[PDB]
Amino acid sequence: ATPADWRSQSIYFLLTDRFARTDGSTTATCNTADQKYCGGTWQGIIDKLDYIQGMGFTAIWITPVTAQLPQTTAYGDAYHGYWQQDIYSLNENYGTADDLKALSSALHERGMYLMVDVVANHMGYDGAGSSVDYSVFKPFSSQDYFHPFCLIQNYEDQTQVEDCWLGDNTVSLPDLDTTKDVVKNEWYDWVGSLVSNYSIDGLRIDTVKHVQKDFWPGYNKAAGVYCIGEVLDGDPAYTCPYQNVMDGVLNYPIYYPLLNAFKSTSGSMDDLYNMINTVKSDCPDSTLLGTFVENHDNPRFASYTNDIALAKNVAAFIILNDGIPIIYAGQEQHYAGGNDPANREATWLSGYPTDSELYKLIASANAIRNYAISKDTGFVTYKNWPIYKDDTTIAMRKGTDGSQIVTILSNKGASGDSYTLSLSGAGYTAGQQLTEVIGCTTVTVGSDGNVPVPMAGGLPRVLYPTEKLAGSKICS
Ligand SMILES: *[C@@H]1O[C@H](CO)[C@@H](O)[C@H](O)[C@H]1NC(C)=O
């Protein structure tokens, strides 16, 4: 699927090993501290697609699929998929090729997209760099395919970042020499064949900043689908230019201020407002970025605060910001694990309740976004516009005039007081009736064009014209 196709999507990102087991058990042990395979499979995903689609997600992103190093290293097993050794074999822990094809088929039967995580930068090896036996890598079974062994010491030295090997010296990540035509050709052929083999609709590309930029346009082209790159850096002046060589990047610039704004009742709305505006104006296309506040490489949101209202506001922002929402499996069950490995909790241990607080919030937010998009072909290309902020509030507007969603977010938390915010600049006509879709209530725009937004319990408010909602099952 093209970048234009992907703009409307909403992604549930999951770890294959940790989302669902073939036997569907909700009690199977998964102690994250052990850092061992817990048994999640591709077949498990298929069996739980109703759970994912009931939240209004239109796509999944799954961790890498290639065969991994076999060892339990000092840092655990390769359950996460980022330590590949044989790119022409699948990771048997997750199932067979027929299972992976069955997963893409099942998603397509539901009108959903499959996004697969891929690594081009490195292989993986249990041991120090000097102990690597290059003959275990397929097809790159020789030192000649790799950069000389060095480590990345200074992330301001872009040559080091690209040419040196990742990690400390415990589990080596041999760095492929992606400047060699033999490596480009192999990777390009591989990725095109992967996408075709398995009818993949888009790719998430790992470790993008660690490969020189001239590699990525050909890789994205060979893939034939939308590619969103992991460029792990909060500085938009560094990260957003990667959109000149790839369709999209993960919105790490927004990540850091977004977390700070909502992780406590003293978070800075100013910093989030400012970063929204910087990304919107300076990044090549904010509507092709992926918005997130939770993933497998940072502490989960609830590790910072268990306040359910703060979690609802950040989840609402992720769904209604420019670009593609990305929710990390477990976020909807208020998982609270800290840094790796603690943030790789097994989703099945929640019991997959479809009535949890954040399941419902996410279902409502995706519902209105999916509905609004189906009625407004300009929603996804209308750049989100922050229209108001104060010490505890940020309000934003997105969508064509007459059909815009106006979202009011708050960091007052669950004990927030009850008051009315007179919101100016929402662009609705006087007397427009609006539905607040999270709580299924109504507000009418005042004669002065201001919206009287009831605020209470620090809850997010998502407004959309009642006429436009018409006879949808949202708030029926
Ligand atoms: C694509 O399918 C062919 C089977 O005709 C297989 O040989 C090839 O390795 C596959 N490529 C990938 C990347 O899976």
Ligand SMILES: [Ca+2]
């Ligand atoms: Ca590299």
